[PDB]
Design a protein around this motif. Structure first.
Motif, PDB file in Angstrom:
ATOM      1  N   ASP A 161      38.217  42.050  29.839  1.00 18.59           N
ATOM      2  CA  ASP A 161      36.949  42.170  29.138  1.00 18.59           C
ATOM      3  C   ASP A 161      37.224  42.739  27.748  1.00 18.59           C
ATOM      4  O   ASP A 161      38.365  42.754  27.278  1.00 18.59           O
ATOM      5  N   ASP A 208      40.319  47.399  26.379  1.00 15.67           N
ATOM      6  CA  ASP A 208      41.635  47.050  26.893  1.00 15.67           C
ATOM      7  C   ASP A 208      42.493  46.420  25.803  1.00 15.67           C
ATOM      8  O   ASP A 208      41.988  45.824  24.848  1.00 15.67           O
ATOM      9  N   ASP A 237      36.082  45.987  26.685  1.00 18.38           N
ATOM     10  CA  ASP A 237      35.648  47.375  26.743  1.00 18.38           C
ATOM     11  C   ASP A 237      36.728  48.350  26.283  1.00 18.38           C
ATOM     12  O   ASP A 237      36.658  49.537  26.618  1.00 18.38           O
TER      13      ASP A 237
HETATM   14 MG   LIG Z   1      38.767  46.295  30.307  1.00 15.09          MG
END
Ligand SMILES: [Mg+2]
Ligand SMILES: [Zn+2]
Lengths: 143, 284, 88, 91, 328, 1096
Positions: free
Chosen positions: B228, B232, B230
């Motif tokens: 995703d 990473d 967020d």
């Molecule tokens: Mg993530």
RNA sequence: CCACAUCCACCU
């Protein structure tokens, strides 16, 4: 999830048999089914002497199957270096470089993928160089 | 099968390094070797001088224990470092075996030269066979290729001049950026997510130079990776040989991997937002 | 020039150990603090493992030593393994 | 992707053989230089800002576009390997 | 599902480049129309159906009945717990059905309902938790609490209900943090045991096969019924027929890879009642020394075409088996 | 700007001091303030009086009597400011008054002996050890006492456990074996308890009428009647059963070591082990433990009650009297004071052994000061505890909330013998007793889940690791203002109501009241209610209490939102959230980060760095400000003055702001206009779209300070001099290096620029700006051998540290988040013109993807958005408790007022309804959002009540189809370390053992390729890629060098060789008796080395 | 020089 992968793993799970009627080896010992098949074909048909190597298939877990392998490099690098290295040191284990883990260890070309001997070498020549060398070939075929 | 002469590892495999202010950091191999050498010398001297049987037997047992501890530590007792630090010494077996041993550091290739990592952001303007690469890390990753390219033209006289030009960013020029764009016209880079669960955790892409610090990623591959947006991060590697470049561009390019290897279900299927939009437009 | 095909692992004879090593270490003196150079014939001796100054230092990465014990000893692996190989 | 991966897969038995062929052609194109191409006259890669795709921006695309045409042959053993392999490294 | 089928059909009938271009166009237009369409979530979008109200009352009444049923000695502790659990797990499903029926009937264009119908985000359980009730909560001991959570996130949870849900939150966190490690260990085991399998082959003369069944042998004590379509597809798609079979006037020649259309045809024929088992080649019967042959392996890949010779099928097999374990 | 509060609950008591746990624990541990004559003895004085007073009766020169009289400490060597500037310890010297007595004449009393320096707690609650500051976190473990546990196998019986401390001591385990065996295993060997009972002076007749009167299991002990008829020689046989080899004639060797002091725990009188004893069983436990030694014989006060109680439970049923292992009433907290006291008494025991040995060696007597006590062991133990312990860990000063939370964290882990990482699954889950004592949400995700947690806001350890929750007394139907702090065991006996129950002032207004009988939600009558919850805030932690609409949030997202509230960087101009809970002022006040007026007075002088205030008494005091202080994590701590010259102030009034406070309110983040709609693709899954307005005005901006340090040390080649001149080349770049070796303040530095010029033996080894980023030099500090009070690492002549500050702004790399756990990463910064905007000219600031709302369960952010939309037009702030917030009708009325104001302002200039608004309203009418048949006026009003307003695209001008929800959200920028920075390298340092490259400070270091990536790479057909990435790009030194040269030459890379890792493995194998060599096709060895293996 | 140990975080 498809069944091909599970079937591959299950086949690798029980690729071992232990013989009941001894041939040229001990009886209560278990090793590769395919090796015993080769030994049976050599003993009965290829060579003289009808000694049936009567075996039974042995089913062992994933860990036991992985540990007990002909190549000692993968077994040593997998679970327990001590026991595997001791066993491979008792008898000189000439590890044939078959399998991807051993070639990764040695850093050489992987037998799978591009490194497969089926496609490992494939001579490539363009049209004009091919025509020149084939002209050399046919002029070698005199008259 | 029992050993009479004990082999001794090469010194650089067990080096002693200055840390700070003259102090030496040494591997436990040196300590074990020192102990074995001292005990063997003591046994030789004792056998030379006289033969008190009980002392000789005790010294034999002690030497045997020292040899065993050198070969493998923990199988009988627990010899330790100097008192005050109760950490057992590391023997040959500990170097070999363990979750962090020689086998589990050479089977893996734990370190790579031409690699980087950065946070990933959505790449909606990108095509499926493209990825956004920050220009500074792209310049750094392709440094030798950039040096050769600018040596081809008149940017620098020799490679040393090019390297000293690129060592400080205040010398950056538009010609350098044009050369960098020319270098990576056909090259591809391998993008990777930290947990590589399946084959699609490594994917080849055609880099596109972008301004920023994050790596632009196509939304449709947000499911091939479990990535995703967020916070990473993902890693990037640069294959060098033309053989590996052809391999990556043919059989690891993201455009050629649209279906799963576990089943026939595609992984490049439209994602959440695309599904929502297409459902809204095609509703009665 | 020949390609690697097989890797064999086996026991090493004391003759093999002596053939591997170039001399024997006797002093348990690694390196003197004042003299950063190697102290004596110990674990880092100059003439037993090769030149430390730039052959390169890589020889010291491969040259091995040996210790001639006055008393025989057995490998711990062959006596403490679950099947005791000497014991069997 | 790249031009005509579908027919490139169609003209070869396995993808790995195709990779070997294209990479060997690329290596030849490098070490000979780009002179011995079979696409020289009109059909060549076109660069954007100039015609820089004449000489050598990326040779994998050269090899692929060259294999897309029918002027190339590949096989396990089509020519005596010893002579060409000894002429490959000693010149 | 429609988009997935569309992508699969386009890949099958067109190829690589065209499928990628179609995917790019779909993504671009989906973004544009999702932007212009204006899907937003407000607190009023989590509509609470009124009927569920009396549903609770009914359940409450039934609850009270069970309560007095316990005070007369007619039931045991286990019986009472089972009755309460069954009643609450039934009224939860009833409330979910009522919520979805209300969304269908009254607000077809509700953002929550629209996202639930499509494959964008959310599940019916999550939509119920938002708008209906998150009734049953598991105890740390592994059982379920007797008292449910009547409120939802549209309303305000009581302190006790939130404290109870923290149990499940902690359980989920710990279960993830450990099951990931267990799945990783299993994956390593499978990769190491299976790493030697590579498809190097001339077609092995294997006069052996496996007969994949098409009927479940036991769903009731004694009865036979057709297996689910997904299971049959996962068992048959991409295989090689052991011997020629003609089932519906079509001659499926021996040695022909089973495509998706062939699987559908076989399923339809089995529904009609012609055959019950399909004889196909399998790796389990392959005679290759180290690996499996092209025929005995099959036809499923990242592409559709039969497997290329020299692919390490063992490692991809192990990865395919181990990947879902972390999300299990 | 008004503040409107919604909750209707009368908080009878305010929040206790949020950091009172550590402060009170340390103040109880160290009694320096009180005179030594005071009765207070628990703590360090307890350790002194317990262990130190060594006595020697007859050993050589006997009669040694070294007694303790007093201890004192009153002066730190240096104030903490230079204790942080210079790497010292903010400690105090400890002095003790000792006196020596022998059997002959002599009073050898030394009033002052120095024995180690003990660290002193700062005002906030932290310690300074070596420059930086650390925090010691509280520990939770099994409370000492007597517990009962069901047998793991046998279901009819169970075991009793009396647990003293330390581990090298007693651990009494009583088991009932069905053959009639009362087994007692003390350390490792079982033992028939009957013999010990006989030793204790109990005969069969009192055992009959005192224990066996009611239970029939006395035959399990009375059966052994053949051997229970000895008063004293039973002790001799008991010692003989032990295996020390000692003669049996030792009456008080081991039978008495389980007596008064040595082995048995000295748990604090009354509550530490006595409360676990006296409450659980019996009536009282006189003394510290079970012993008498005045007559040689022995007495008990535990064994008989424990046997009676165990037989009662196993035979009859006094009650459900089995102790839960995870019951928080049976668990105890060792705070910083207890840990420090334990380590101090360990050091004291070491010192006692040392002094005993010295006395044994020493001959004469007049040697009390020096020849007896040496400070080395105790000081070493204290320093080791404060430096290398696991619970003494680096302070997290990202923001005041982070420091406070780190100060009030409770850990199950510790020294290692209590709790450990790898297996803790059973104890990770929360317990029914955690309600009101431990936050069920504050735990951190990852490996450290459940083990580490934080106590409740109203939670309080009273005196001995027992968390107490406040409860209001309820008598009949009236709720009394009396508040009592209760423990879990005390709580388990009453019925406790809830704070949300209806109230008529001092009367219960409901008929059916929810309550907790014993951790069980039940419904009862008001007459059966005894206690009432003080407030919902007592159920959650301080960090969790800051989420406004917690009642409409999932537990997981609330957990992570509370976690990320910790790691929010302070901004240059930070502002308080539009929606607050009410703890922000308490958080900033209790965390000593701001300045408050201690007394009524008038401000005299206000400057940017100090404030001089004259109080009412005429005394003027100057308060300095840490203007730009680098934090532990690299952020900036600022005190901004908030008063004007000649301004009257009240007691406790605000004087200067904290690092992250607006006006006495916790302000870590910004309030921005958020629209919950999906943009093109830039908010796809969790990404965030932000405006350039937030960047045109410095709105998300933080100052980051990096501290570089380089030291010149004395080497054998010669001392290194910090000198301005550079040996070889750099003179053009020397302009920035103004003074001798140190760069001038205020000079901007780019990567690769000289910071400090150091010359080694001459060779240039100078500190340069590492690749990456560099800012403005703000401070430089130099420490030399001319020590005023500083100490340095031996061999180092001097050290210089340079602080470089830069002004980081919001960009794509950064990530933002709200209090509800909605993480996000900025993906695109749009210009102002093309973003969605209201019908007015004002555009939105941030666009959030709605799809993240239903997949998870975080509806609190939607309520916050609606309330912020109301407050944006009403121009007011709102305070709503977590579980007593604003009802939906209240928010609807506020939105109605806001719409009235907004549309009245719109109509003031003479404008009606836009045609775009008309078509949007008709489309929404087709969607059922608004009732039909109404004019656009009230239709738009009803749409506003939903929290949705019409937006215009801005790029196209046409309105976005359907209404869009917009509002004001509190969005904060999280901690931003090098994680986003690209560790991209092409060539760098290599390791020594293997040649795999890993750098760090010099170069970024290579990226991991592991085995999973290898498995994926070889799952494809890629073989040459793997071959070059394992050998050419990883290990093969000749291969990598040749490849680098070829790439520079513009030629193809050469074929790789055997990696050095395999050579290392081969040599390590050859180190053992093994023998490995590579073979050719035939049995011909092939040397992997060129010729180096071969001799000569 | 980067060795090892301990601790805190981030992404699965
Ligand atoms: Mg993530
Ligand atoms: Zn086959």
């Amino acid at each position: 999830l498809h069944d091909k992968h599970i079937e591959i793993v299950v086949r690798q799970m029980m690729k071992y048999v232990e013989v009941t009627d001894p041939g040229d080896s001990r009886l209560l010992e278990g090793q590769v089914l395919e090796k015993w098949d080769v030994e049976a074909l050599n003993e009965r048909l290829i060579a003289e002497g009808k000694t049936p190597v009567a075996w039974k298939p042995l089913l062992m877990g994933v860990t036991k199957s992985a540990l007990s392998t002909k190549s000692w490099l993968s077994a040593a690098s997998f679970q327990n270096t001590t026991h595997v290295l001791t066993e491979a040191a008792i008898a000189g284990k000439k590890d044939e470089l078959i399998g991807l883990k051993e070639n990764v260890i040695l850093g050489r070309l992987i037998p799978a993928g591009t490194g497969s001997d089926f496609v490992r070498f494939t001579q490539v020549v363009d049209q004009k160089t091919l025509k020149a060398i084939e002209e050399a070939r046919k002029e070698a075929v005199e008259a | 099968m029992i050993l009479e002469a004990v082999p001794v590892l090469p010194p650089d495999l067990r080096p002693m390094v200055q840390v700070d202010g003259g102090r030496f950091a040494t591997s436990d191999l040196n300590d074990l070797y020192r102990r074995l050498i001292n005990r063997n010398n003591r046994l030789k001297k004792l056998l030379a001088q006289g033969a008190p049987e009980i002392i000789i037997r005790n010294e034999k047992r002690m030497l045997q224990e020292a040899v065993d501890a050198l070969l493998d530590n923990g199988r009988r007792g627990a010899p330790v470092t100097n008192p005050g630090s109760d950490r057992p010494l590391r023997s040959l077996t500990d170097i070999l075996s363990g979750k962090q041993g020689r086998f589990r550091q050479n089977l893996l290739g734990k370190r790579v030269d031409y690699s980087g990592r950065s946070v990933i952001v959505v790449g909606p303007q990108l095509k499926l066979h493209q990825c956004g690469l920050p220009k500074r890390m792209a310049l750094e990753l392709f440094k030798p290729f950039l040096l050769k390219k600018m040596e081809e033209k008149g940017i620098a006289p020799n490679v040393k001049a090019a390297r000293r030009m690129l060592e400080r960013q205040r010398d950056i020029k538009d010609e350098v950026w044009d050369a960098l764009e020319e270098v990576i016209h056909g090259k591809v880079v391998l993008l990777n997510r930290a947990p590589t669960l399946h084959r699609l955790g490594i994917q080849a892409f055609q880099p596109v130079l972008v301004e920023g610090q994050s790596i632009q990623l196509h939304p449709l591959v947000c499911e091939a990776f479990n990535a995703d947006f967020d916070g990473d991060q993902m890693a990037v590697h640069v294959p060098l040989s033309s053989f590996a470049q052809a391999e990556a561009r043919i059989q690891m390019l993201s455009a050629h991997n649209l279906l799963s290897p576990a089943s026939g279900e595609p992984l490049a299927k439209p994602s959440r937002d695309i599904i929502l939009g297409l459902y809204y437009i095609t509703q009665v | 020039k020949k390609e690697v095909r097989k890797v064999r692992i086996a026991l090493a004879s004391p003759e093999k150990i002596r053939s591997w090593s170039y001399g024997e270490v006797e002093k348990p003196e690694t390196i003197n603090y004042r003299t950063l150079k190697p102290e004596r014939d110990g674990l880092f001796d100059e003439r037993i493992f090769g030149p430390i100054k730039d052959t390169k230092s890589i020889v010291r990465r491969y040259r091995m030593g040996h210790i001639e014990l006055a008393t025989p000893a057995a490998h711990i692996w062959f006596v403490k393994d679950v099947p005791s190989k000497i014991g069997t | 992707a790249e031009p005509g991966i579908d027919k490139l897969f169609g003209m070869v038995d396995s993808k790995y053989r195709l990779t070997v062929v294209v990479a060997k052609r690329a290596q030849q194109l490098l070490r000979h230089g780009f002179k011995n191409t079979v696409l020289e006259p009109e059909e060549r890669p076109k660069m954007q800002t100039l015609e820089g795709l004449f000489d050598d921006p990326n040779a994998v695309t050269w090899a692929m576009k060259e294999l897309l045409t029918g002027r190339l042959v590949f096989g396990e053993n089509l020519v005596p390997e010893d002579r060409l392999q000894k002429e490959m490294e000693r010149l | 599902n429609s988009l997935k089928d569309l992508v699969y059909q386009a890949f099958l009938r067109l190829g690589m480049e065209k499928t990628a271009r179609l995917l790019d166009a779909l993504k671009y237009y989906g973004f544009t129309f999702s932007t212009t369409s204006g899907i937003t979530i407000g607190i009023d979008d989590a509509v609470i159906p009124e009927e569920k109200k009396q549903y609770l009352e009914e359940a409450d009444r039934k609850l009270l009945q069970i309560e007095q049923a316990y005070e007369m000695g007619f039931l045991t502790d286990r019986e009472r717990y089972d009755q309460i659990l069954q009643l609450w797990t039934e009224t939860t499903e009833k409330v979910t059905q009522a919520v979805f029926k209300n969304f269908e009937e009254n607000y077809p264009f509700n953002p929550l309902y629209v996202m639930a119908q499509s494959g964008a985000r959310g599940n019916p359980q999550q939509i119920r938790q938002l708008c209906g009730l998150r009734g049953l909560m598991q105890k740390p001991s592994g059982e379920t609490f007797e008292v449910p959570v009547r409120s939802s996130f549209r309303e305000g949870l009581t302190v006790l209900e939130y404290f109870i849900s923290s149990h499940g939150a902690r359980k989920g966190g710990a279960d993830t943090a450990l099951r990931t490690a267990d799945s990783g260990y299993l994956t390593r085991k499978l990769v190491d045991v299976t790493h030697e399998i590579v498809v190097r082959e001339a077609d092995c003369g294997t006069t052996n096969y496996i007969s994949v069944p098409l009927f479940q042998p036991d769903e009731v004590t004694r009865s036979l019924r057709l297996r689910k379509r997904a299971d049959i597809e996962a068992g048959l798609y991409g295989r090689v027929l052991a011997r020629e079979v003609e089932v519906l006037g079509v001659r499926l020649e021996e040695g022909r890879y089973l495509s998706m259309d062939d699987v559908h045809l076989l399923i339809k024929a089995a529904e009609a009642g012609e055959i019950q088992e399909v004889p196909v080649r399998s790796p389990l019967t392959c005679q290759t020394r180290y690996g499996v042959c092209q025929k005995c392996y099959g036809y499923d890949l990242s592409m559709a075409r039969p497997v290329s010779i020299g692919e390490a099928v063992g490692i991809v097999a192990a990865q395919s088996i181990g990947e879902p374990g972390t999300q299990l | 700007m008004e503040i409107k509060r919604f909750g209707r609950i009368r908080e009878v008591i305010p929040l206790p001091p949020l950091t009172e746990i550590q402060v009170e624990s340390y103040r109880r541990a160290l009694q320096a303030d009180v005179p030594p004559e005071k009765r207070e003895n628990v703590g360090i004085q307890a350790a002194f009086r317990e262990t130190f007073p060594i006595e020697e009766e007859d050993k050589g020169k006997g009669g040694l009597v070294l007694d303790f009289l007093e201890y004192r400490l009153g002066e730190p060597p240096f104030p903490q400011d230079e204790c942080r500037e210079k790497d010292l310890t903010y400690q105090a010297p400890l002095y003790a008054r000792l006196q020596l007595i022998h059997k002959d004449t002599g009073l050898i009393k030394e009033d002052e002996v120095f024995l180690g320096h003990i660290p002193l707690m700062t005002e906030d609650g932290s310690f300074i050890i070596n420059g930086a500051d650390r925090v010691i976190v509280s520990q939770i473990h099994r409370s000492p006492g007597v517990y009962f546990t069901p047998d793991p196998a046998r279901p009819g019986r169970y075991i009793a456990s009396i647990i003293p401390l330390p581990k090298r001591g007693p651990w009494i385990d009583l088991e009932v074996e069905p053959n009639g065996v009362v087994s007692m295993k003390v350390n490792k060997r079982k033992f028939p308890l009957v013999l010990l009972l006989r030793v204790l002076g109990y005969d069969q007749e009192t055992l009959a009428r005192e224990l066996g009167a009611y239970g029939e299991l006395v035959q399990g002990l009375m059966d052994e009647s053949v051997f229970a008829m000895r008063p004293e020689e039973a002790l001799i046989r008991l010692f003989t059963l032990l295996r020390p080899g000692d003669p049996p004639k030792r009456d008080k060797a081991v039978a008495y070591v389980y007596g008064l002091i040595a082995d048995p725990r000295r748990y604090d009188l009354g509550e530490a082990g006595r409360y676990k004893a006296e409450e659980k069983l019996g009536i009282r436990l006189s003394g510290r433990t079970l012993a008498r030694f005045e007559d040689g014989e022995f007495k008990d006060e535990v064994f008989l009650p424990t046997l009676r109680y165990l037989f009662a439970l196993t035979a009859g049923v006094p009650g459900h009297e089995v102790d839960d292992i995870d019951h928080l009433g049976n668990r105890r907290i060792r705070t910083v004071g207890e840990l420090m006291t334990d380590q101090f008494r360990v050091g004291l025991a070491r010192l006692a052994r040392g002094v005993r040995e010295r006395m044994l060696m020493g001959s004469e007597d007049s040697l009390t000061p020096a020849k007896l006590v040496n400070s080395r062991p105790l000081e070493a133990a204290i320093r080791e505890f404060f430096s290398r312990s696991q619970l003494s860990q680096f302070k997290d000063e990202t923001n005041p909330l982070s420091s406070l939370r780190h100060k009030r964290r409770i850990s199950a882990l510790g020294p290692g013998g209590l709790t450990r990482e790898r297996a803790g699954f059973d104890v990770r889950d929360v317990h029914r007793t955690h309600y009101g004592r431990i936050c069920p949400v504050e735990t951190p995700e990852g490996a450290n889940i459940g083990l580490i947690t934080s106590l409740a806001a109203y939670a309080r350890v009273d005196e001995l690791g027992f968390i107490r929750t406040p409860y209001r007394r309820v008598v009949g139907g009236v709720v009394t203002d009396e508040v009592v702090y209760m423990t879990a065991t005390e709580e388990d006996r009453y019925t406790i109501a809830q704070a949300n129950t209806p109230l008529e002032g001092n009367r219960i207004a409901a008929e059916r009241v929810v309550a907790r009988r014993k951790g069980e939600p039940v419904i009862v009558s008001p007459e059966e209610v005894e206690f009432m919850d003080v407030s919902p805030k007592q159920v959650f932690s301080v960090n969790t209490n800051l989420i406004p609409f917690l009642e409409h949030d999932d537990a997981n997202r609330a957990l992570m939102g509370s976690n990320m509230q910790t790691q929010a960087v302070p901004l240059i101009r930070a502002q308080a959230p539009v929606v607050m809970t009410g703890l922000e002022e308490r958080v900033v006040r209790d965390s000593l980060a701001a300045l408050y007026a201690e007394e009524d007075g008038e401000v005299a002088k206000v400057d940017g760095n100090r404030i001089v205030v004259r109080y009412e008494d005429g005394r003027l005091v100057e308060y300095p400000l840490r203007r730009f202080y680098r934090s532990n994590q690299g952020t900036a701590l600022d005190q901004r003055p908030r008063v004007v010259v000649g301004q009257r102030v009240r007691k406790g009034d605000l004087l200067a702001d904290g690092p992250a406070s607006e006006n006495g309110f916790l302000a870590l983040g910004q309030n921005v206009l958020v629209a919950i709609m999906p943009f093109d693709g830039y908010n796809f899954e969790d990404a965030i779209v932000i405006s350039e307005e937030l960047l045109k005005r410095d709105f998300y901006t933080s100052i980051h300070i990096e501290r570089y340090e380089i030291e010149a040390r004395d080497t054998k080649l010669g001392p290194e001099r910090i000198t301005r001149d550079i040996p070889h080349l750099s003179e053009a770049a020397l302009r920035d290096l103004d003074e001798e070796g140190v760069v001038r303040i205020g000079a901007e530095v780019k990567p690769g620029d000289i910071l400090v010029g150091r010359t080694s033996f001459v060779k240039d080894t100078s500190l340069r700006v590492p690749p990456g980023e560099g800012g403005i030099v703000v401070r430089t500090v130099r420490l030399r051998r001319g020590d005023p009070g500083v100490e340095l690492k031996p061999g180092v002549r001097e050290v210089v540290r340079v602080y470089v500050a830069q002004k980081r702004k919001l960009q794509v790399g950064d990530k933002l988040a709200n209090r509800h756990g909605n993480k996000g990463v900025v993906a695109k910064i749009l210009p102002v013109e093309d973003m969605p905007h209201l019908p007015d000219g004002t555009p939105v600031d941030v666009i959030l993807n709605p799809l993240g709302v239903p997949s998870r369960m975080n509806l609190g952010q939607i309520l916050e958005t609606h309330l912020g939309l109301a407050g944006y037009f009403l121009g007011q702030r709102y305070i709503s408790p977590i579980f007593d917030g604003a009802k939906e009708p209240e928010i609807k009325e506020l939105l109605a007022q806001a719409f009235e104001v907004y549309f009245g302002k719109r109509k003031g200039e003479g404008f009606g309804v836009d045609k775009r608004e008309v078509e949007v309203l008709r489309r929404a009418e087709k969607l059922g959002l608004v009732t039909p048949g109404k004019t656009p006026e009230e239709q738009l009003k009803e749409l506003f009540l939903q929290g949705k307003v019409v937006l215009y695209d801005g790029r196209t001008g046409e309105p976005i189809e359907g209404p869009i929800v917009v509002g004001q959200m509190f969005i904060m920028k999280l901690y931003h370390m090098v994680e986003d920075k690209m560790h991209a390298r092409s060539t760098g340092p290599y390791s020594l053992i293997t040649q795999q490259p890993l750098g760090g400070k010099a170069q970024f270091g290579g990226q991991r390729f592991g085995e999973m990536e290898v498995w994926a790479l070889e799952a494809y057909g890629a073989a040459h890629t793997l071959q070059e990435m394992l050998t050419l790009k990883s290990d093969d030194i000749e291969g990598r060098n040749a490849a680098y040269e070829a790439i520079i030459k513009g030629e193809d890379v050469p074929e790789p060789s055997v990696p050095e890792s395999f050579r290392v493995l081969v040599k390590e194998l050859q180190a053992l008796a093994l023998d490995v060599q590579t073979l050719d096709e035939k049995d011909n060895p092939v040397d992997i080395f060129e010729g180096l293996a071969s001799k000569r």
